Design brief:
Elements: H1 5-12, H2 17-37, H3 46-54, H4 61-80, H5 98-101, H6 112-121, H7 125-135, H8 144-147, H9 151-158, E1 163-168, E2 172-177, H10 180-189, E3 194-196, E4 208-210, H11 233-247, H12 254-273, H13 278-287, H14 295-301, H15 308-319
Antiparallel strand pairs: 1-2, 3-4
């Protein structure tokens, strides 16, 4: 039911009825972790706070942040009563990146607002560009659309209603409308000469590494001893890896990022329409000009992730629930 009951009930007794409603469930879900370490939340280490919250299995950064803030209030109260062994509130030491480590292991997809917050903490344009370009649908077989992308296509798209012309190694050409932000990020990434390691935090003597000189947006490193030609598959995965290491998350894969794009578009339609059904799915396909065997097949595949359950899960705050 609850760990350290008579102390928790003493804290609860100082809160409004509405606060008791928020704080109580946190203590019930917390109980099993507290009995595992045989100590209270207020004696938890940083890591144990981050683990604790992950066990609540929360979907969004926004909700994690509300959960952490509630936990701080309890810890401060416990500090002011000197129940805590430690003198400082360890929930307050939790940095912005560490918030992503709090995300539950069910989380598969990123919201648009999460994409924007992640972009803003990523110092490299190679990092920013792969995230965004994938979210907005630039991805062929083995990421051929993304790896074959040049300044010139980016430049042309800006002067053509933001409509990119994409080159795939299997099927050839595809037309995709993207955002202006995506195109400016793509244009920066295509002229970048350096790549800071560990997202600008590299501890070592070596902090940056030279990139190849070419007109491609996705660039191989000079020390890899590949040409001034296109990058391979593995560069995309390594760029996602370095993003994933900075935020310390394990759900982020090229396919996952591409879906999140589809899932954000589904939210926008759900807000106006109020249903998610095959009509929505057909619209997403031709909004992203989707490269598919057939459309009906794609619409079937999309029922795994494009549905009301997933949209309510990821976008609850934005929907007003």
């Amino acid at each position: 039911s609850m760990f350290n009951s008579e102390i928790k009930e003493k804290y609860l007794d100082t809160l409004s009825e509405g606060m008791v409603m928020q704080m109580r469930p946190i203590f019930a879900k917390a109980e099993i972790t507290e009995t595992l370490y045989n100590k209270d939340i207020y004696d938890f280490t940083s890591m144990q706070i981050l683990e604790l919250i992950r066990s609540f299995d929360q979907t969004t950064i926004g909700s994690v942040r509300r959960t952490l803030a509630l936990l701080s209030l309890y810890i401060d109260w416990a500090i002011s009563y000197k129940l805590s062994k430690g003198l400082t509130n360890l929930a307050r030491t939790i940095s912005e990146e560490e918030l992503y480590e709090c995300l539950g292991d069910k989380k598969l997809y990123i919201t648009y607002s999460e994409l924007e917050e992640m972009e803003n903490q990523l110092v490299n344009y190679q990092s920013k560009a792969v995230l965004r370009l994938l979210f907005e649908g630039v991805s062929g077989l083995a990421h051929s659309e993304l790896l074959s992308l040049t300044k010139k296509q980016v430049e042309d798209a800006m002067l053509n209603g933001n409509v990119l012309t994409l080159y795939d190694s299997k099927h050839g050409e595809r037309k995709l409308k993207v955002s202006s932000e995506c195109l400016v990020i793509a244009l920066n990434a295509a002229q970048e000469t350096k790549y800071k390691l560990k997202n600008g935090k590299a501890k070592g003597q070596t902090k940056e590494v030279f990139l190849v000189e070419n007109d491609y947006v996705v660039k191989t490193k000079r020390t890899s001893n590949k040409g001034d030609g296109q990058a391979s598959k593995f560069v995309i995965t390594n760029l996602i890896t370095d993003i994933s290491e900075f935020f310390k998350i394990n759900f982020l894969t090229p396919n996952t990022i591409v879906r999140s794009g589809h899932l954000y578009r589904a939210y926008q339609l759900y807000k106006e329409k109020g249903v998610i059904d095959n009509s929505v799915r057909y619209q997403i396909i031709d909004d992203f000009n989707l490269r598919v065997k057939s459309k009906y097949r794609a619409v079937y595949s999309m029922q795994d992730y494009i549905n009301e359950e997933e949209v309510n899960k990821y976008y609850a705050e934005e929907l007003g629930l």
